[PDB]
Amino acid sequence: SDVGTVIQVGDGIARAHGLDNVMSGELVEFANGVMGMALNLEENNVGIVILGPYTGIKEGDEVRRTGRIMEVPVGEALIGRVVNPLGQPVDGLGPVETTETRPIESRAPGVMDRRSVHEPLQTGIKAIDALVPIGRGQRELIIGDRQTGKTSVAIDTIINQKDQNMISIYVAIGQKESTVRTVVETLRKHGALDYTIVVTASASQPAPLLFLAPYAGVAMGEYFMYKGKHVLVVYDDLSKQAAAYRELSLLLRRPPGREAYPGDIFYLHSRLLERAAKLSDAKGGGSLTALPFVETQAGDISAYIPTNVISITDGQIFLQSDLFFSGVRPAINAGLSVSRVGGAAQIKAMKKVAGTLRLDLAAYRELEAFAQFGSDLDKATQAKLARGARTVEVLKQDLHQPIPVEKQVLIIYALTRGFLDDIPVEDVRRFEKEFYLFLDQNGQHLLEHIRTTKDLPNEDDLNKAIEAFKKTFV
Amino acid sequence: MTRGRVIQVMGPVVDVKFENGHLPAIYNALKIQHKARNENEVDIDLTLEVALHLGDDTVRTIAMASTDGLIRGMEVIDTGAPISVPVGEVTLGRVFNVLGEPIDLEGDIPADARRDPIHRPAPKFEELATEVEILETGIKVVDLLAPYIKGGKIGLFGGAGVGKTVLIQELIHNIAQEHGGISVFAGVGERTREGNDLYHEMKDSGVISKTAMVFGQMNEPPGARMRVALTGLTMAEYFRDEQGQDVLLFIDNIFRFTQAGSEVSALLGRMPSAVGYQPTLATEMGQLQERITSTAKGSITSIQAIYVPADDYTDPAPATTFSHLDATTNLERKLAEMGIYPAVDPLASTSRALAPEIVGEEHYQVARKVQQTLQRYKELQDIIAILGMDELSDEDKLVVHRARRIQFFLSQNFHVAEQFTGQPGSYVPVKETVRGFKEILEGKYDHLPEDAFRLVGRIEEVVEKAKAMG
Amino acid sequence: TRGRVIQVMGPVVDVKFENGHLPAIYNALKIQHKARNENEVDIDLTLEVALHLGDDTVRTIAMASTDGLIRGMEVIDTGAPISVPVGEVTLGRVFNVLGEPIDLEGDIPADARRDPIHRPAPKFEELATEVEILETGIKVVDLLAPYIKGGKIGLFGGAGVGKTVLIQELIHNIAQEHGGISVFAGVGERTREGNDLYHEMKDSGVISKTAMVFGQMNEPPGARMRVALTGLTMAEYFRDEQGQDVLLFIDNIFRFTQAGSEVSALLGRMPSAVGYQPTLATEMGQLQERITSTAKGSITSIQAIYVPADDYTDPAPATTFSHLDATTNLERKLAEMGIYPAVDPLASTSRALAPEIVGEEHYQVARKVQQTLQRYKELQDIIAILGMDELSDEDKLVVHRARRIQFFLSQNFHVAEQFTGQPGSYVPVKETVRGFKEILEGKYDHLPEDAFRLVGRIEEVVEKAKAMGV
Numbered sequence A: 001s002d003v004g005t006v007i008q009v010g011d012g013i014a015r016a017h018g019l020d021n022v023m024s025g026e027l028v029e030f031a032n033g034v035m036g037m038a039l040n041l042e043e044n045n046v047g048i049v050i051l052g053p054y055t056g057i058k059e060g061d062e063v064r065r066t067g068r069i070m071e072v073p074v075g076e077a078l079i080g081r082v083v084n085p086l087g088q089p090v091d092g093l094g095p096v097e098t099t100e101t102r103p104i105e106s107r108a109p110g111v112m113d114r115r116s117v118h119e120p121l122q123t124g125i126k127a128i129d130a131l132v133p134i135g136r137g138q139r140e141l142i143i144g145d146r147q148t149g150k151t152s153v154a155i156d157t158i159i160n161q162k163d164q165n166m167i168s169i170y171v172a173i174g175q176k177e178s179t180v181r182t183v184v185e186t187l188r189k190h191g192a193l194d195y196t197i198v199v200t201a202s203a204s205q206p207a208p209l210l211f212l213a214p215y216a217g218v219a220m221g222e223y224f225m226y227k228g229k230h231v232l233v234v235y236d237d238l239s240k241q242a243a244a245y246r247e248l249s250l251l252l253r254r255p256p257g258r259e260a261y262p263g264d265i266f267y268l269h270s271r272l273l274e275r276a277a278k279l280s281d282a283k284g285g286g287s288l289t290a291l292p293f294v295e296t297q298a299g300d301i302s303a304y305i306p307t308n309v310i311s312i313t314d315g316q317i318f319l320q321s322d323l324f325f326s327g328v329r330p331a332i333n334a335g336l337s338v339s340r341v342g343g344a345a346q347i348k349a350m351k352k353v354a355g356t357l358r359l360d361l362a363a364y365r366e367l368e369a370f371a372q373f374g375s376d377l378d379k380a381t382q383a384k385l386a387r388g389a390r391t392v393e394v395l396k397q398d399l400h401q402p403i404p405v406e407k408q409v410l411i412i413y414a415l416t417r418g419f420l421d422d423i424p425v426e427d428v429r430r431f432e433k434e435f436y437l438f439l440d441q442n443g444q445h446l447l448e449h450i451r452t453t454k455d456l457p458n459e460d461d462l463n464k465a466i467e468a469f470k471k472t473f474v
Numbered sequence B: 001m002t003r004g005r006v007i008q009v010m011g012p013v014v015d016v017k018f019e020n021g022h023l024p025a026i027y028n029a030l031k032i033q034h035k036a037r038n039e040n041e042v043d044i045d046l047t048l049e050v051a052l053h054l055g056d057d058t059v060r061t062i063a064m065a066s067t068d069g070l071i072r073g074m075e076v077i078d079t080g081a082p083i084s085v086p087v088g089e090v091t092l093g094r095v096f097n098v099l100g101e102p103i104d105l106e107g108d109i110p111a112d113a114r115r116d117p118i119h120r121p122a123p124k125f126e127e128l129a130t131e132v133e134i135l136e137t138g139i140k141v142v143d144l145l146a147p148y149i150k151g152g153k154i155g156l157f158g159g160a161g162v163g164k165t166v167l168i169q170e171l172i173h174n175i176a177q178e179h180g181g182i183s184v185f186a187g188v189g190e191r192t193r194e195g196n197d198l199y200h201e202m203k204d205s206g207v208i209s210k211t212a213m214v215f216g217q218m219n220e221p222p223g224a225r226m227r228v229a230l231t232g233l234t235m236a237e238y239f240r241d242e243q244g245q246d247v248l249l250f251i252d253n254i255f256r257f258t259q260a261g262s263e264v265s266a267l268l269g270r271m272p273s274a275v276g277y278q279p280t281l282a283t284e285m286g287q288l289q290e291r292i293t294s295t296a297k298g299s300i301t302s303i304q305a306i307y308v309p310a311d312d313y314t315d316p317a318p319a320t321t322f323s324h325l326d327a328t329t330n331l332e333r334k335l336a337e338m339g340i341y342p343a344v345d346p347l348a349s350t351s352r353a354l355a356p357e358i359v360g361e362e363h364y365q366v367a368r369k370v371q372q373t374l375q376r377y378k379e380l381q382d383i384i385a386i387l388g389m390d391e392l393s394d395e396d397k398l399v400v401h402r403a404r405r406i407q408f409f410l411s412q413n414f415h416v417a418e419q420f421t422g423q424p425g426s427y428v429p430v431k432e433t434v435r436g437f438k439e440i441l442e443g444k445y446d447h448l449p450e451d452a453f454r455l456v457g458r459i460e461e462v463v464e465k466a467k468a469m470g
Numbered sequence C: 001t002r003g004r005v006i007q008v009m010g011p012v013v014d015v016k017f018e019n020g021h022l023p024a025i026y027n028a029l030k031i032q033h034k035a036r037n038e039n040e041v042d043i044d045l046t047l048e049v050a051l052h053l054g055d056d057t058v059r060t061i062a063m064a065s066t067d068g069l070i071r072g073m074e075v076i077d078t079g080a081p082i083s084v085p086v087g088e089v090t091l092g093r094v095f096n097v098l099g100e101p102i103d104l105e106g107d108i109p110a111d112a113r114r115d116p117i118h119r120p121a122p123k124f125e126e127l128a129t130e131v132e133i134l135e136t137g138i139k140v141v142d143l144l145a146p147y148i149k150g151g152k153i154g155l156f157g158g159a160g161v162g163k164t165v166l167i168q169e170l171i172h173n174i175a176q177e178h179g180g181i182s183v184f185a186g187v188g189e190r191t192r193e194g195n196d197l198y199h200e201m202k203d204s205g206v207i208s209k210t211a212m213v214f215g216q217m218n219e220p221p222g223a224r225m226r227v228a229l230t231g232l233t234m235a236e237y238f239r240d241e242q243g244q245d246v247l248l249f250i251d252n253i254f255r256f257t258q259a260g261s262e263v264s265a266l267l268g269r270m271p272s273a274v275g276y277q278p279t280l281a282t283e284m285g286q287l288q289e290r291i292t293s294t295a296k297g298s299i300t301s302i303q304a305i306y307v308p309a310d311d312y313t314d315p316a317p318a319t320t321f322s323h324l325d326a327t328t329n330l331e332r333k334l335a336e337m338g339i340y341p342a343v344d345p346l347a348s349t350s351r352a353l354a355p356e357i358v359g360e361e362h363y364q365v366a367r368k369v370q371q372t373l374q375r376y377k378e379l380q381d382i383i384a385i386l387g388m389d390e391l392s393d394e395d396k397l398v399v400h401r402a403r404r405i406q407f408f409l410s411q412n413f414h415v416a417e418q419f420t421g422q423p424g425s426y427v428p429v430k431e432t433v434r435g436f437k438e439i440l441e442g443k444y445d446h447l448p449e450d451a452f453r454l455v456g457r458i459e460e461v462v463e464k465a466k467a468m469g470v
Ligand SMILES: Nc1ncnc2c1ncn2[C@@H]1O[C@H](COP(=O)(O)OP(=O)(O)OP(=O)(O)O)[C@@H](O)[C@H]1O
Pocket: A145, A146, A147, A148, A149, A150, A151, A152, A175, A179, A236, A237, A329, A330, A397, A398, A399, C322, C349, C350, C351, C353
């Protein structure tokens, strides 16, 4: 009947008799009070995964089904809080007091509900904003090796998100809690906390919570995009999600696959990533853009999980420790990085300048590869080498210091037209900041023209302002 | 017929037990329709494809939709035939899922339409024809250096962000604009955003009415993403068998078809092979590409795109598909990041129909001279980098001078670039291509600045752009 | 209540509790038998439950050698997990996994407090963080990757690279100065190293501030598994109930997961990764998560991680890399070159290397050193392919200074006075940054490269060059 005894217990997994009316995915509750999900139905047993501290369960304990699927509480009051995958606060400060709940297992917006991506997502990082643009609804992947300045990009984009009316959810999977506290403090000291929500899944929390964490992340962004606001979602690690699912599948005795991963990995990651979209004007115009992270050993981005995620995403940002220790930060590989919304998700002046910038960088990328060996060369090769060197020099910027788009396009215009020819390479970094200060004090009208028009100012005014600053610099 | 009851659920996999013993055959279709009796139960509609028999009247089935909410003891009903996509004139200008039900809100196909089982025995040896007919695309690079063939399979290879989807979409538009033949598009696990953008772009183009589209979405179980290509092929099959004309079949990506096959094998419990791939790969690829054959009546030409995972042409899926191609066109990221659009590498793209007697001797001579100049330029670029263009002698100077122009003129603007750069686009017939390339080879336009050749169509457009620039 | 043993397979035993009562997971069981005849052997054993089975059956991991067990023997149930004696009494003494003392000096009475070893980790609100630098006097760590008080420190390296030398040098330097309780727990390390360290600590008198627990590698997997948890349990009381700062030293924690896989193969878990048990990350995360610094108390933990075949790609080091605030990697090639220690300058960086924490000049010197070392790292490949004569003048200067910079990072150590007979030195941070700035600006162009080898302070470089006769 509906009641049934537990016949096995181990490693967060149980098996039960009876339960002849259970449903796949149904929440099931024990006498200990811990919750779990039924995942496998057999001829006379049910495979249960436990969402909590399981050590208390013993053989002969009666287990009963709740009768519902897991629902994440949703509300406007969650903003600024730190929450589990379950709807329970872990920050203290009492209950969060949500309005209502939404099932995690839900269907995605299909064709003729979406619309083309046409409005940018500002990160404040010159290299990615110029050469690899992102627009709302775009599912941009970021991938690299350990400790290569990955999370600095997401933190900078969340800090710069203050400009645009977007909730920036941060979901941490399988990480140490002290890192969660450190990133929360880094967000709070820069004032970004009031428009952010942090979801934390500890490395020591039972694996099914790590299995369900990204769905609890998408639930809130989905509710907000239904309400009509823009949303940004960041996953700090999908590889740990894959490891948790592999472990929880292998304990269930499901057949393995390419690297002991079960057969459902691509199904699960596509189910997660397909909810990110850009709803049509009719629906309300919301957007749920995503920035998943993937960890890779020794930059072997050809491994199974990176291949899956790169075939699911609409672009990648390849980060390498080689450029990181080369002195070029953030270490973004322009050649291997691609984005398939490149022309639509930018303002017109950004497109106009960035096209020529990318052309110059592309030429230098091939010339520099072996021009270094030859000491003596003809003058035009020297000119192209210097152009590439100054190009790469300008892109360098300070950490936790996002730059407004208009100063980006002004300094990139200074770069592309060759105004930096006189400046020795070392002076360029000081030139950028002093140029910013000079345009702040004197050349404000250009910034007014850009902010109002959303297009490049008249050539004469920009040229006069840049040369006027160049007069003072030494 | 008699109902069957569920016994097991393991995600996409489901098992049924037909107690009385009248079992369905392999590849059949099973329907699950449930209405909740208590407030605890859910309503679900599910399609199941049989894959194996396990004895004791039990069968093992792969689901085409999400299996959440299943309950043991619910009845399953057997259709008695494979999944049957409705076909005929009712399928033109619409979008369908793997099951052949309309995704578009424009309406629902009625019972009047004839239905074709997707799974069908292949054409036999005696039926097939051997004649060769060239297909004109109007693209200078494709028409000049890699002609496509009616009934033959054409492959598009390249990395990410190089324009394979742009090329296939603009080729669909060009074919429907000029040749006017029917076409069918199958999206195997296409990005929902890209599918919707393609639908809107084709609707604006006025081409949808002539074509037909079927989509298998990424968020669906791997079995549906596998079977979507077969349902598209069944649409083209009915068009070719009854209407007897030159149908075309476009397939978004075979890579995801192979991946879905591997996932279904892993779920079913078969031992892996090669690089984690399913034991039966060559067979499935062979079937999917051998039902696409040109009989005497109709061609069913196909253009197919494939992604290279790590820039290595050795992964089992690219190799198996590589074995089956008549013409291969590979796209390079360096060309895509250069100003040269489209990004097609001339030297590495080949077609077995480039024989002089098939295309004509003038076409062969001009193509050979073009490739010779390109090879000499590629070799000379290394010297140019260190010592410059002035060090090499006059013959090398003239060779590189012509080579730069030929690389530029291989590019052209097209109608789909309206979104990306706002230019109208051009269409160049093959004779104009060979004329222009012969002219640039003979060098009547040595005086013209090189920039005039960058993105125009006909050579008189080079003349007009040279007039414009001054 | 008692249960009867029915199976024994190496480390694993199988008890059956037919009385109608079952032990919970992690419970401890007692085996005591008196030989009834000359054939039987007297045995004393303890079994911890790890899994459950249907017929009252439970699978238990044995803590000691299983030889001599007979089916049908009776197992006593303690009804509680493994209890460890913790308190002020533990200082000085040495204990085994079960909590029994090892030294013959004395015994622990019943009056002493004993508390279980298994418990949940601290919550989010209890944690706290700070950026205070923890000076070690080692040039590499101080200048290129500073450690932090209260931050986890990790040492990575293969067999025979110099890992233990760092452990002993750090323990000497910091334990001589800090007034914090120290807990040492060797996980499967050589017993001779434990005995030598015990003699050294008796010479240093620090034993009154130290408590020690040992799990030898020759001991069955269970002891190597639970010993780190026991040491952590003692450090837990010292951190929280006493409210005193504590330091936890652990050697080669990898043996924990090695023993876990040893017993997991017998436990019937399907294989995964490179033979590793499926539950690797959960257990390792539990153990590492319990080692945290709260507001009640702080734990500065220095650990060492063995790498199976000198390849960091292995899943256990990869999982460990995520749980560390500071990491220094040891490379065999540096050991072969003669540069000691073997910390690689281009792969070690702590969370504390920020301009505000260390100061502007320190950060700039560190980053210029790293840049120059990377440039040399590519120049060596260039030299191998092209030769050492084709480099440019500035490239010659870059290599010239890179050689001296990588040489100066070597330091004469304290504990190495036994191995080689040199005094040893303790270098302040300010001296490190000043010397590195001086060499970076090329003030010592004249000095030979060897003068920079194995010296404490730059004045010793000058003295060594004087000894050379320069
Ligand atoms: N612009 C920058 N300039 C200097 N250092 C930078 C810059 N951006 C990032 N970093 C460095 O990046 C490091 C942060 O590590 P990183 O963001 O790569 O971690 P992660 O591996 O992504 O972490 P997580 O475990 O949270 O996923 C710091 O040491 C910081 O100094």
